[PDB]
Design a protein around this ligand. Structure first.
Ligand SMILES: COCC(=O)Nc1ccc(O)cc1
Length: 284
């Protein structure tokens, strides 16, 4: 029985290596990674791979790994798939820990934009969680943390992390991680999966998929929102992604909104992540 080597980038930046039977479904590898991580609340997470176009795809746990990675390497990342709107309701601290690690990468990467003050506050909770109580013996007036806090680091940001770190004396790792999440969850782009698209007129937009629904960012002025309740039907055909918006009270007909994606694979990927978000956040 022939086995394929899998390499998974974990949220702490380390690499997990295991073997699965070459006809294995994605769930097999996912269960191995979750066992390695001592993770029980697995429903929020998934594995990603890069397709032949170098796009991030979710590994479908129900389908064979080889029919997804196809010609590519058996290289994956472990990631948060469904960002819980209320992390306080997760049953385990270790779940919240992995959610923190993902969010720290969302911030450093620039996927999750954040004010100066919130970068410093999130940073201060990470330091409290990881080093414990502020000690002046480590940090002088010229201190720069090994911790990556932001897409662009400044001395003023490092200073503000330390000033807020001082305020967290006696805070336990679980407590600091919960505070991290209470702040991160409020950011306007928290758990928003962005897809480049064009509207029915050819104007470039972004489509965001998240717990509350489908967001349409036309620019900073003009943001349309479709709560999962208000979106009746989803579809994709060729390069195009359509949403069927349920009739308002006393309106005779559902309305249809069409978007143009870069290519057919981009339209299918957006369709699938929307169907999955709708199912998950309908049930949660
Ligand atoms: C297989 O599912 C197809 C589909 O249309 N799904 C769907 C997604 C969001 C929504 O609000 C309503 C429905």
């Amino acid at each position: 029985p022939k086995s394929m080597q899998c390499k998974v980038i974990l949220l702490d930046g380390s690499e997990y290596t295991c073997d699965v039977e070459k006809r294995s479904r994605g769930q097999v590898l996912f269960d191995k990674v979750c066992e390695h991580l001592n993770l029980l609340e697995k429903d929020y997470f998934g594995l990603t791979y890069r397709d032949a176009e170098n796009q991030k795809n979710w590994l479908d746990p129900a389908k064979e790994i080889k029919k997804q990675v196809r010609s590519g390497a058996w290289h994956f990342s472990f990631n948060v798939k469904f960002y819980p709107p209320d992390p306080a309701q997760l049953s385990e601290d270790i779940t919240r820990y992995y959610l923190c690690l993902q969010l720290r990468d969302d911030i450093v990467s620039g996927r999750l934009p954040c004010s100066f003050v919130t970068l410093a506050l999130l940073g201060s909770y990470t330091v409290q969680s990881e080093l414990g109580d502020y000690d002046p013996d480590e940090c002088g007036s010229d201190y720069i943390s090994e911790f990556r806090f932001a897409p662009n680091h400044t001395k003023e940001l490092e200073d503000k992390v330390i000033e807020l770190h001082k305020s967290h004396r006696g805070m336990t790792p679980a407590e600091a991680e919960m505070h991290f999440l209470e702040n991160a969850k409020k950011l306007s782009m928290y758990g928003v999966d962005l897809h480049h698209a064009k509207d029915s007129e050819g104007v470039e937009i972004m489509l965001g998929v998240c717990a509350s629904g489908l967001l349409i960012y036309r620019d900073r002025l003009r943001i349309n929102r479709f709560a999962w309740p208000k979106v009746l039907k989803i579809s994709y055909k060729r390069n195009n992604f359509y949403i069927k918006i349920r009739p308002g009270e006393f309106e005779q007909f559902e309305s249809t909104i069409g978007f143009k994606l870069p290519n057919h694979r981009a339209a299918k990927r957006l369709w699938k992540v929307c169907v999955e978000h709708h199912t998950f956040f309908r049930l949660l």
